[PDB]
């Protein structure tokens, strides 16, 4: 077999679901960008220390039952340091420096790309790319339940400083805090 499948680029290439957002009958949900959200794609990045990667995002909107309704939604990106919107009618949604993507539910999922946002040369896992904001357009509530899922790919993977993997299960989100053996056991030494 060739070396193309085991390469660093193809190991982070496959897409995954990094978020789940549900809007009951609120109107707006602010979700912070994090790659540590789920167990998968997390253990993989702790193998390395320094990582430099572009971010590709996918916005998929639907209802709880799956049917699509012709309703217009707004997808806004908030750069690091910018104030977060406190409501739907607030000033943060009319801000010119916050890019927006206007898509409908019948509109197939839009794809946006986020360049490298860190002031340093690479990320340090041992990382805030900003936050999102999403609301339904109009000054009135929308009588439809919106449940959306965000897909995230990784483009132009760069890796440095390979680190040993973590055998113990994760405790908290921001810290790698009953020790467990990393391997199974057997009754004797000479047994197979």
């Amino acid at each position, epitope marked *: 077999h060739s070396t193309q499948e085991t390469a660093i680029g193809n190991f982070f290439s496959r897409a995954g679901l990094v978020s789940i957002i549900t809007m009951p009958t609120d*109107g707006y949900a602010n979700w912070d960008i994090d790659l540590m959200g789920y167990a998968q794609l997390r253990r993989k990045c702790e193998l390395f220390t320094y990582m430099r990667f572009d971010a590709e995002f996918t916005f998929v909107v639907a209802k709880p039952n799956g049917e699509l309704v012709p309703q217009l939604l707004q997808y806004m990106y908030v750069p690091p340091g910018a104030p977060k919107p406190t409501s739907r009618d607030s000033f943060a949604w009319q801000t010119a420096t916050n890019p927006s993507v206007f898509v409908k539910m019948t509109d197939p999922p839009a794809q946006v790309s986020v360049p490298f946002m860190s002031p340093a040369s690479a990320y340090q896992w041992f990382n805030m790319m900003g936050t999102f904001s999403i609301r339904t357009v109009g000054t*009135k509530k929308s009588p439809h339940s919106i449940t959306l899922r965000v897909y995230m790919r990784i483009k132009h993977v760069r890796a440095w400083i390979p680190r040993p993997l973590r055998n113990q299960p994760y405790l908290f989100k921001t810290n790698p805090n009953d020790i467990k053996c990393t391997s199974t056991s057997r009754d004797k030494i000479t047994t197979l």
Partner: antibody
Amino acid sequence: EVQLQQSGPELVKPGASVKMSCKTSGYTFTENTMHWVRQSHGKSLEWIGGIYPKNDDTKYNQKFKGKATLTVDKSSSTACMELRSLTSEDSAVYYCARGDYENYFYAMD
Amino acid sequence: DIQMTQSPASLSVSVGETVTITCRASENIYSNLAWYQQKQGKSPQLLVYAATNLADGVPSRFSGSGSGTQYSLKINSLQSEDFGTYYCQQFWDTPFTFGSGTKLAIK
């Protein structure tokens, strides 16, 4: 039988604060939510705010953002409300009502 | 902002007649409306919610109706225990703005 008992009225100097608390009984507190309603003179009703003690998360009226402050105690199954910077027109009647099941809709019985 | 008022200011209906009361809303909730019974010196209680279903302790004499931005409450017939005022409720968006209130009398 669901019963919510409030405290007694108090005399507050304008500019000071006030402590309003009413205990809950007859049901399970933490699964449901809490709300507050102010009755202004002569006859009017207004929704102060609500608290759902699973997080805790809350929402208030636009005018009460800088006045009303809510907190809950799940040990004694009571709900508390704080009001500051009282003025001459702030004299009114308050109510203690229990909301829906993880919902603020479904009008309170 | 969401805003609504009732009409008319006050009514007078004796025992055994039909009461027609309405509260109009500016926007359209499509779903939820509630009516409260508040006497002198006592707290309100729930009567009819969602413009259709009625709460416990309420007899069949109270029936709601209406759709869209036009709602109504039909009382047939009136009894001597129904004295008090009525309000309206809107779940459409926060904050909730209640009704202005309407007083009842006996002709």
